[PDB]
Design an enzyme around this catalytic site. Structure first.
Site, PDB file in Angstrom:
ATOM      1  CG  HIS A 292      -0.542   0.598   2.407  1.00 31.41           C
ATOM      2  ND1 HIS A 292       0.505   0.088   3.135  1.00 31.41           N
ATOM      3  CD2 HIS A 292      -0.983   1.676   3.087  1.00 31.41           C
ATOM      4  CE1 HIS A 292       0.699   0.836   4.199  1.00 31.41           C
ATOM      5  NE2 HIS A 292      -0.193   1.803   4.195  1.00 31.41           N
ATOM      6  CG  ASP A 293       3.908   1.974   2.878  1.00 32.90           C
ATOM      7  OD1 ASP A 293       3.103   2.853   3.235  1.00 32.90           O
ATOM      8  OD2 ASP A 293       4.478   1.200   3.666  1.00 32.90           O
ATOM      9  CE  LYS A 296      -1.156   4.603   0.261  1.00 29.55           C
ATOM     10  NZ  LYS A 296      -1.629   3.502   1.158  1.00 29.55           N
ATOM     11  CG  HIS A 321      -3.131   7.651   4.870  1.00 28.46           C
ATOM     12  ND1 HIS A 321      -2.963   6.359   5.309  1.00 28.46           N
ATOM     13  CD2 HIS A 321      -2.073   7.917   4.073  1.00 28.46           C
ATOM     14  CE1 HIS A 321      -1.852   5.867   4.806  1.00 28.46           C
ATOM     15  NE2 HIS A 321      -1.292   6.791   4.052  1.00 28.46           N
ATOM     16  CG  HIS A 345     -23.943  -8.002 -17.271  1.00 32.47           C
ATOM     17  ND1 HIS A 345     -23.449  -8.924 -16.373  1.00 32.47           N
ATOM     18  CD2 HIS A 345     -24.483  -8.718 -18.286  1.00 32.47           C
ATOM     19  CE1 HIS A 345     -23.695 -10.144 -16.817  1.00 32.47           C
ATOM     20  NE2 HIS A 345     -24.321 -10.047 -17.976  1.00 32.47           N
ATOM     21  CG  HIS A 346     -21.818  -2.483 -13.664  1.00 37.29           C
ATOM     22  ND1 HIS A 346     -20.997  -2.608 -14.765  1.00 37.29           N
ATOM     23  CD2 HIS A 346     -21.472  -1.315 -13.071  1.00 37.29           C
ATOM     24  CE1 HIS A 346     -20.180  -1.572 -14.825  1.00 37.29           C
ATOM     25  NE2 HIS A 346     -20.447  -0.772 -13.809  1.00 37.29           N
ATOM     26  CG  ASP A 362      -0.678   2.679   7.482  1.00 33.00           C
ATOM     27  OD1 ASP A 362       0.192   1.820   7.620  1.00 33.00           O
ATOM     28  OD2 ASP A 362      -1.424   2.712   6.509  1.00 33.00           O
TER      29      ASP A 362
END
Length: 414
Positions: A292-293, A296, A321, A345-346, A362
């Protein structure tokens, strides 16, 4: 769930792109351009595969993040790379020599980058062709590129496509295609393979190539380009590989924060144990924590460090954040086949849990550590700031879990 190789690379690639990348989905666009050039050279499927990755991973080497470089930055780089492992006195003299010209520095810079990127490719278990061809990215047709001064077809085909693809995109987006077409035309025979340039010349006539370039969903379209081989499902072992490889990339890209990823992962696992999360979920969580860093490079929360400030309200908003964290995680996290099928389609909740745990970690790191400039906050003080600030900004299933977990730790640790 599982990840497709192509899919994960694009994501990781895009993110690490934001640092020094230049433009938001630059790598993605090169891929699209580069695959299309390749598509027209009647390459073999394996070659197209290798090309796909070379294009995506071209900048893997870049150790920079981002009117020029600082002297300090420049010196630091020379030292840290050369002279390497010789009398101190030698290293200074040698570093000075490089500094002064020309040239030499640029050669060092490329060599390092190109070697480093080639290394990533190998770590990621791509072929030597891919690695070689990240390595020669910066060679020029006329034998005036670095680091080896290869000329013509001494240069690997992938690098030729990639470099060309790359330059074109930068112009394409900074000015107008016609301007871009013109520029590459200008460097034909100098930077570029003339034959390749021609091809681009054609593609431009071909709309739908253009449409694809300027598409919002381009990331999805690029996916459709490669051979199926690109889409391999990723098993655990490969994932470790990717994570492990990238972590090195992150550590290289942001030296000042190093060990931040490891710490967050640790806190994250600790929180998770408290919540009685499953072994498997934890495994994702730990990888996710490092991943995830990526990007960033934007300042943390929130300047921070700065001894002075560090008061509330102003970061009530800054608490989004993730926000970014949630979005990035969603893109990152493993997926369910039936679920993906059932959307031509969705999962949503888990991301939230994941986000909450990692986010909590974090924040905890941010209050503590404050180490450079030095200034560690006591654990319990930092813990207090959260609860002091919370229900508003701090989950609290996690906050409790954090506290409980920390409690178990030896009290030596401040």
């Amino acid at each position: 769930g599982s990840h497709m190789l192509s899919e994960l690379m694009i994501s990781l690639t895009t993110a690490l792109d934001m640092t020094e990348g230049q433009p938001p989905e630059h790598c993605i666009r090169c891929c699209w351009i580069g695959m299309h050039i390749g598509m027209q050279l009647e390459l073999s499927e394996p070659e197209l595969h290798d090309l796909f990755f070379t294009l995506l991973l071209k900048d893997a080497g870049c150790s920079s993040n981002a009117v020029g470089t600082s002297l300090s930055s420049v010196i630091n780089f020379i030292v840290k790379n050369t002279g390497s492992e010789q009398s101190w006195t030698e290293r200074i003299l040698t570093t000075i020599d490089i500094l002064k010209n020309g040239n030499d520095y640029a050669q060092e810079l490329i060599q390092t980058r190109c070697t480093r990127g080639a290394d990533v490719a190998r770590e990621l278990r791509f072929s030597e062709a891919v690695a070689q061809g990240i390595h020669s990215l910066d060679e020029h047709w006329n034998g005036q590129g670095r680091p080896e001064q290869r000329k013509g077809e001494a240069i690997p085909l992938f690098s030729r496509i990639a470099l060309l693809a790359q330059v074109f995109d930068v112009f394409q987006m900074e000015h107008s295609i016609e301007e871009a077409l013109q520029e590459i035309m200008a460097r034909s025979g100098v930077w570029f393979d003339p034959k390749l340039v021609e091809v681009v010349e054609q593609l431009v006539e071909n709309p739908r190539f253009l449409s694809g370039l300027k598409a919002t969903d381009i990331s999805q379209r690029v996916m459709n380009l490669p051979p199926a081989q690109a889409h391999l499902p990723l098993d655990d072992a490969y994932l470790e590989c990717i994570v492990t490889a990238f972590g090195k990339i992150v550590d290289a890209k942001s030296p000042y924060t190093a060990g931040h990823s490891e710490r967050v992962a640790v806190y994250t696992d600790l929180i998770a144990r408290q919540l009685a999360i499953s072994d498997a979920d934890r495994i994702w969580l730990r990888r996710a924590a490092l991943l995830h860093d990526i990007g960033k490079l934007g300042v943390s929360n929130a300047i921070l460090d700065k001894p002075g400030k560090l008061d509330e309200a102003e970061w009530r908003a800054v608490q989004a954040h993730a926000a970014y964290t949630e979005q990035i995680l969603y893109k990152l996290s493993p997926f369910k086949t039936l679920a993906r099928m059932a959307g031509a389609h969705h999962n949503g909740d888990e991301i939230s849990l994941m986000t909450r745990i990692i986010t909590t970690a974090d924040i905890f790191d941010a209050l503590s550590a404050e180490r450079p400039y030095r200034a560690a906050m006591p654990i319990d003080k930092a813990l207090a700031i959260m609860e002091e600030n919370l229900h508003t900004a701090i989950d609290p299933e996690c906050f409790a879990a954090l506290a409980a977990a920390l409690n178990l730790l030896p009290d030596e640790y401040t």
